[model samples]
Target chain A: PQVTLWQRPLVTIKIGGQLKEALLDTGADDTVLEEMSLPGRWKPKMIGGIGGFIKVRQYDQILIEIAGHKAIGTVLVGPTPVNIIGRNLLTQIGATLNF
Target chain B: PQVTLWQRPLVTIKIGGQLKEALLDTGADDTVLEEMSLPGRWKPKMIGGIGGFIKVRQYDQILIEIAGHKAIGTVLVGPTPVNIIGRNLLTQIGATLNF
Candidate 1:
């Protein structure tokens, strides 16, 4: 789907057997989610953005259903203001930036 | 042109008579640039993102050439890690997220 930038490009996604909303964030280098319970072992990591760097629990081999497309990659659980689907997951679902 | 996530979606922009690269940041609510000399009236404002809020100089009606496409909109100047072209200018350049 082609999403115009008039509004936020938020998409419905399925993760950890729950439905959630995530932003199509091309600017972010990694996918970050709000604190959640996922059955796996995670290592502490840091991801930086415009504001600053924040430590997070990085989990790999995670499965997510984004806009009806399934993707498996590394997902970080952090105290982000919003759930973000970054380029890692975007590339899996074949998302692109178009003009 | 449709840009894939194999690389950063950095676009060359013409601002202040010098060419600079700005990210196509769909996650940002407002376009924020690195500190630079801009001629205009600005107001002190704070914008929140994945991490937290930061104070910035908000300038409106600023003209920027994004990917050779001319756009005029509100631009924020702050100590951002990188220049970001947010939804404000993305909409001006008719950018979209397609899957």
Candidate 2:
């Protein structure tokens, strides 16, 4: 699929056995999802962005289905403005920016 | 040109008759540059992201050369950790995300 930048690049993804909407955010270096209850052992972590820094729970080896492309990586659960699938998972799914 | 997410999508751009490196950030809805002297009339605006919101000055109709592609749009100048080329100008250059 090709996503243009005119609008927010929102896409449906599958995680934790539920369908969720997430942004394919190339600006972010790490994937961040709104805080959720997921069964896993996680570590407290912090990530910074355009604004400031936020503390998150880092859950490792999580499987995510982004538009049918499966990727397993570390996912951060925290207070984010939106669900963001960042470069970590994007690279695993062979996503690229073309102009 | 194609940019993979394995690394930061850093590219050189021409602005204010000088060269600067910026990130092609699809996650960001608006372009924000580090504090610099841009001659023009601007309006105060606030934009929020992952961490929090920041106050910025919006300069409209600024000509920027991004990766050799010319784009004219609203650019926000403020205290940013890094320079970012957001979706606003990306759409002008026909940038798309492909997998």
Candidate 3:
């Protein structure tokens, strides 16, 4: 799959049996989602972004679907302004930045 | 050149005779710098990201170098948490998001 650079690389993702839109952020290190419920107990952590630091709950071993591709990865539930699909999940789908 | 998603996709860029490292942010709509003196007049505007919105000076027709590739595009100067190489300049270098 190829995505043009002319628009924001937003994609539909299915995670924790829910569907949502997420921005494919190569610059971000971890996948972040708005507060959500996952099965396991999580550890609290802070992440810094363009503005400042926000706290998040780290959930491990989660299954996610992006563009029909399935991947198992970690997800961070936080007060993120947007849902972001970072390189962690991007690599699982063999995503690359190309010229 | 190919970049692995295991780490933040940070790249070095050259602009106005200076060198800097910037994140390759496919999620960002425009290129943003912390603070730089470019040779031009700029219009003020605000852009929103994962954290929140921030004001910027939008400079047009700026020459930039990324990974030895040259491009002339718009660059927004502001108090950004990090320097970002966004789609505005990425397209000029034929950058694409692929899987």
Candidate 4:
């Protein structure tokens, strides 16, 4: 049995310039943020090679505290009306959920 | 009553260069293709301003025949392993389906 090194959680990020909270999925392998989080702390980064998607970069790391425990990491931003969360920040937080 | 100009369906697109059929959804507003469909007729395009996503361009138009009806349109490609379809092509062809 292969146990995960870090606990994963379905996190809700406080994206700057946006008021909506998106799900952080452990199933994902990257830091995917919502588009609504833009116009604030996030900056757009033109992406290619993967497929059809628009992405933004974080000027600073994100700090999140959940279940009374806190964690910080870089957030990769993407378009809205969507939900995505990957292993990078998820493993650091030590929590997990299936939805 | 807001009547849609065309019927909508959860269409399966025969993406170029890949061995998979992606869904064409009317609920979506744009032509979003999958990344797996890349390395074929789809070329990569770096996109920004939204959040984070990678998109591909269609080298040719896609022709889909369903329910004995046929439709053709240029497809916007993207990375996949997910389901996505939109209204741009849906309206031109006519389809309607729930989930």
Which tens-of-lDDT digit does each residue in B11-69 have in candidate 4? Answer: 34454423344344322345555543433365555432123455556544676443234
Give a tens-digit lDDT track for model 2, residues B1-99: 999788999999988788999999888888899999988899999988878989999999999999999999999999898899999999999999998
**CAPRI quality level assigned to candidate 3 from its DockQ score:** medium
Q: Using DockQ as the measure, which candidate wins? A: 2
Over 4 Å off in model 3, which ranges?
Answer: none
TM-score of each: 0.97, 0.98, 0.92, 0.35
Better of 2 and 4 by DockQ: 2
| lDDT by residue (tens digit), candidate 1, B33-96 | 9989888899999987656778899998999999999999899999788999999999888889
- Tally clashes: model 4: 35
Better of 2 and 3 by DockQ: 2
Q: State the DockQ of every prediction.
A: 0.81, 0.87, 0.71, 0.05
Mind giving the per-residue lDDT tens digits that candidate 4 earns over A1-99? 111112222334544423334444322445555543334465556442223455557544666543334456666655544544445554665433211
Model 2 misplaced stretches (Cα beyond 4 Å): none
lDDT of 3 by residue, B1-99 (tens): 877787788888999999999988888878999987888889998887766677889999999999889999999999888999999998899998988
- Candidates 1 and 3 compared by lDDT, better number: 1
Per-residue alpha-carbon lDDT of candidate 2 for residues A1-99, written as tens digits (9 for 90 to 100): 889888999999999898999999998899999989877799999998777999999999999999899999999999999999999999999999989
Off by over 4 Å in 4: A1-20, A36-51, A66-68, A96-99, B1-99
lDDT of 3 by residue, A20-88 (tens): 998888888888999877788898988876665888999988899998899888889988767898888
Show the colliding residue pairs in model 1. Answer: none
TM-score of 4: 0.35
List the pairs of residues colliding in candidate 3: none
